[PDB]
Design an enzyme around this catalytic site. Sequence first.
Site, PDB file in Angstrom:
ATOM      1  N   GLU A  31       4.572  -4.925   4.818  1.00  0.00           N
ATOM      2  CA  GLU A  31       3.175  -4.700   4.440  1.00  0.00           C
ATOM      3  C   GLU A  31       2.378  -5.986   4.238  1.00  0.00           C
ATOM      4  O   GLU A  31       2.931  -7.027   3.879  1.00  0.00           O
ATOM      5  CB  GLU A  31       3.104  -3.852   3.169  1.00  0.00           C
ATOM      6  CG  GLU A  31       3.649  -2.446   3.357  1.00  0.00           C
ATOM      7  CD  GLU A  31       3.392  -1.541   2.168  1.00  0.00           C
ATOM      8  OE1 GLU A  31       3.027  -2.047   1.085  1.00  0.00           O
ATOM      9  OE2 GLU A  31       3.561  -0.314   2.318  1.00  0.00           O
ATOM     10  N   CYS A  82       2.914  -0.405  -3.671  1.00  0.00           N
ATOM     11  CA  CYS A  82       3.531  -1.434  -2.837  1.00  0.00           C
ATOM     12  C   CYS A  82       4.761  -0.936  -2.130  1.00  0.00           C
ATOM     13  O   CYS A  82       5.820  -0.790  -2.741  1.00  0.00           O
ATOM     14  CB  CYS A  82       3.866  -2.634  -3.726  1.00  0.00           C
ATOM     15  SG  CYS A  82       4.474  -3.996  -2.787  1.00  0.00           S
TER      16      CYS A  82
END
EC number: 2.1.1.192
Length: 359
Positions: free
Chosen positions: A89, A339
């Site tokens: 990410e 996250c």
Amino acid sequence: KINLLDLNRQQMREFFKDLGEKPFRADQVMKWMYHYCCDNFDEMTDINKVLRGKLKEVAEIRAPEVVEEQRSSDGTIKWAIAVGDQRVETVYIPEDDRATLAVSSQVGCALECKFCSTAQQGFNRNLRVSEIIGQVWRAAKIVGAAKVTGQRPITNVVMMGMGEPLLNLNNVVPAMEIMLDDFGFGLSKRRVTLSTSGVVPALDKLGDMIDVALAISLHAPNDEIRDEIVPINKKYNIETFLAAVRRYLEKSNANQGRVTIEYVMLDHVNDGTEHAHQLAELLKDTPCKINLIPWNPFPGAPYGRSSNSRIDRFSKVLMSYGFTTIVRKTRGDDIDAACGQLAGDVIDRTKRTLRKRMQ
Ligand SMILES: C[S@@+](CC[C@H](N)C(=O)[O-])C[C@H]1O[C@@H](n2cnc3c(N)ncnc32)[C@H](O)[C@@H]1O
Ligand code: SF4
């Protein structure tokens, strides 16, 4: 071909030296790569055709591709970044005075923090230099390169994506050198932040090889609670971690003598006033800025987000002792702020392979 995004300026110069070129031609090439977000040797006008021909034969500029994108209403952009088979990410977080990029260090993580969604996946492999700085390159390009748009896309970089940075020093340091480099992204060492759960021996090593801004992931007033929250505390406890932080600051001046302390707020685990008091006593010797982060929930985790009233009490306790405490605003609430959620399960790997066949 050699990927030029794997190399820092020292390594970029010596490569060009073997090609039969003078050092500053590498600097000139880096400038095209980072200031203009260019990956095409034909687009580099102020480089002679001969040098251009050598670069196309033995070298490439291959940045990680965006497989998925999510744009929030508050400006926050979140990307799923392809790195071979697996995914990591990268989050763009725009503000008024700063523009912050959250970069991943590894594929997964081996440290098993119970409040992190990447923990349940487990560790797969570390990222290459190109795969770390190429997140910044790719983000800068899509947002808008400095010498293309006139405004710098990214003013702040934090190693707070997937992975533990300190367990990938060989690739993370050179990548950060490129962030710091003038012919790279030209960032101040105040604007390059490395976050760590506390791999002490590696932290002592980090200070010998680079000076960047340190932020620690503490999350607890004591060792009894942190053993549960952050497992690495079993190996290197809080006072061993705090003593390692002081040793780093004697060598580092990016923090300006004050380490950043990350502190997530978990419902009835570490957010009562009794935890604030303990935490205040704990840090009485260590100068710091305390960031109180609201916990972004995700499916599966055995925790709840702390109510904002309890976050204020917790904050005001610390502020009474004279600690500078910041309550961090949540970003991307309309999208997957958690996250490691966009880059989902590990089993999708196989399902992606069958996707390309019938494309
Ligand atoms: C993902 S870690 C990566 C870098 C390093 N291993 C560390 O722990 O600092 C960076 C930060 O993300 C935060 N974080 C991880 N999962 C989170 C979650 N589910 N909700 C809110 N913050 C989270 C942690 O507080 C941590 O300080
Ligand atoms: S919080 Fe940081 S160290 Fe702990 S698991 Fe998530 S990524 Fe690894």
